[PDB]
Design an enzyme around this catalytic site. Structure first.
Site, PDB file in Angstrom:
ATOM      1  N   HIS A  68      -0.275   5.695   5.213  1.00 22.33           N
ATOM      2  CA  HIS A  68      -1.023   6.336   4.000  1.00 22.33           C
ATOM      3  C   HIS A  68      -0.445   7.707   3.530  1.00 22.33           C
ATOM      4  CE1 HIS A  68      -4.345   4.057   6.142  1.00 22.33           C
ATOM      5  NE2 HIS A  68      -4.695   3.970   5.006  1.00 22.33           N
ATOM      6  N   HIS A  72       2.157   4.737  -0.838  1.00 21.87           N
ATOM      7  CA  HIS A  72       0.911   4.094  -0.898  1.00 21.87           C
ATOM      8  C   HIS A  72       0.140   4.384  -2.133  1.00 21.87           C
ATOM      9  CE1 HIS A  72      -2.979   2.111   0.159  1.00 21.87           C
ATOM     10  NE2 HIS A  72      -3.508   3.377   0.274  1.00 21.87           N
ATOM     11  N   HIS A 106      -6.715   9.051  -3.620  1.00 23.22           N
ATOM     12  CA  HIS A 106      -7.647   8.509  -2.761  1.00 23.22           C
ATOM     13  C   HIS A 106      -7.396   8.683  -1.481  1.00 23.22           C
ATOM     14  CE1 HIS A 106      -5.273   5.101  -2.229  1.00 23.22           C
ATOM     15  NE2 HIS A 106      -5.799   4.779  -0.958  1.00 23.22           N
ATOM     16  N   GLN A 269      -4.071 -10.922  11.298  1.00 20.03           N
ATOM     17  CA  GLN A 269      -3.630 -11.103   9.753  1.00 20.03           C
ATOM     18  C   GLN A 269      -4.470 -12.289   9.251  1.00 20.03           C
ATOM     19  OE1 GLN A 269      -1.965  -8.919   7.492  1.00 20.03           O
ATOM     20  NE2 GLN A 269      -2.901  -7.761   9.106  1.00 20.03           N
TER      21      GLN A 269
END
Ligand SMILES: Cc1ncc(C)n2nc(CNc3nc(-c4ccccc4)nn3C)nc12
Ligand SMILES: [Mg+2]
Ligand SMILES: [Zn+2]
Length: 313
Positions: A68, A72, A106, A269
């Site tokens: 993060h 990103h 964001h 996944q």
């Protein structure tokens, strides 16, 4: 006003494709973002000097966490750029403006922990914001940077154009709370199939922008397999740190966050592609047909995780 950013040829061509990787050269990411603003919005959208000052303050307020992070942020903005450029005439002047800024902003000031970890640790942000804890914090930091001297990139808008663009950014950032994605995509799925979807209904656009945000946010699954696979190592490095911190609070973490259950990642996944990723890009493709390359790449990556389970990789 005659100063267009340009990129080397391989980047000039490949930035237009959904599977583009912004590369390991940090110092080129600001120019990549400006290039994208200039082509999706115009050289006229933002005063260059204010935009550069905003970009560098946004960068400085992302932390050095495995996933993060600033990389990103720029990656999620690039996916938004691709969606916007493949759906030229569907979006207002203000949405073009607002949505690349929303994507860049964001995850501002993310610490590498889930909302769930903040609530169990009893972090101050968990009392200030009881749902979408980090996402309300991210929007808050965006408004902070926008109000620094020389940082109001929106200063040419009217009071009400300004209020609409901050409202677009808030909803868009809130929508990156994956807890909210499931309900949002179900509604969109139902509206599209019963033929009620109406892109002139503001509460419908909102939902469509929410889904685009989820799509951009998850876009590591739409890359070339070696990008997808190496990004997944960054994703689990955060989860396993949070797992350790759960164990320190005397709580067994979910298996996704337990570094002792590394082995089950391939199967995790699969769950993730089936339960979250594939449904996300399917519904997006139904609503915005030119985003199909995202569904196609996600599928290719599901099939690569299936190979990993079969020991073919
Ligand atoms: C690629 C990607 N992009 C974004 C997000 C938010 N995520 N979240 C995951 C985690 N998915 C996941 N891993 C496990 C698991 C893992 C190890 C053991 C047991 C279970 N279960 N599930 C559902 N992958 C991604
Ligand atoms: Mg987030
Ligand atoms: Zn994100």
């Amino acid at each position: 006003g005659l100063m267009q950013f340009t990129l080397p040829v391989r980047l000039c061509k490949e930035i237009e494709l959904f599977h583009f990787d912004i590369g390991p050269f940090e110092n080129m990411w600001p120019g990549i973002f400006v290039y994208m603003v200039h082509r999706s919005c115009g050289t006229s959208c933002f005063e260059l000097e204010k935009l550069c000052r905003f970009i560098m303050s946004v960068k400085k307020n992302y932390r050095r966490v495995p996933y993060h992070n600033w990389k990103h942020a720029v990656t999620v903005a690039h996916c938004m750029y691709a969606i916007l450029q493949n759906n030229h005439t569907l979006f207002t002047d203000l949405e073009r403006k607002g949505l690349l800024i929303a994507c860049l902003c964001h995850d501002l000031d993310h610490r590498g922990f889930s909302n769930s970890y903040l609530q169990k640790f009893d972090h101050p942000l968990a009392a200030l914001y009881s749902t979408s804890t980090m996402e309300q914090h991210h929007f808050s930091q965006t408004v902070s940077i926008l109000q620094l001297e020389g940082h109001n990139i929106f200063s040419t808008l009217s009071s009400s154009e300004y209020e609409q663009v901050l409202e677009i950014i808030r909803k868009a950032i809130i929508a990156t709370d994956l807890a909210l994605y499931f309900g949002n995509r179900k509604q969109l799925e139902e509206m599209y199939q019963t033929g009620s979807l109406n892109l002139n209904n503001q509460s419908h656009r909102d939902r469509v922008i929410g889904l685009m945000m989820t799509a951009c946010d998850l876009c590591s699954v739409t890359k070339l397999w070696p990008v997808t696979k190496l990004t997944a190592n960054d994703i689990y490095a955060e989860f396993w740190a949070e797992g350790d911190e759960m164990k320190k609070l005397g709580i067994q973490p979910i298996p996704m966050m337990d570094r002792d259950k590394k082995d089950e990642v391939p199967q995790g996944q699969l769950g993730f592609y089936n339960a979250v990723a594939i449904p996300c890009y399917t519904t997006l493709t139904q609503i915005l047909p030119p985003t199909e390359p995202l569904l196609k790449a996600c599928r290719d990556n599901l099939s690569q995780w299936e190979k990993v389970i079969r020991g073919e990789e």
